[PDB]
């Protein structure tokens, strides 16, 4: 609940979560290898 912590641990949700689409992006949409 810390603004800081909280308010870190609540925006590294959303930005493991879509900085892991490039890797269901990439290695599904070009995997031709």
Known sequence: ???T???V???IR???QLLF???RIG????RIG
């Open 27 to 30: 290695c599904r949409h070009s």
């Open 14 to 16: 959303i930005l493991q």
């Open 1 to 3: 609940y810390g603004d």
């Open 5 to 7: 912590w909280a308010g």
């Open 21 to 23: 689409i490039h890797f």
């Open 9 to 11: 641990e609540a925006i």
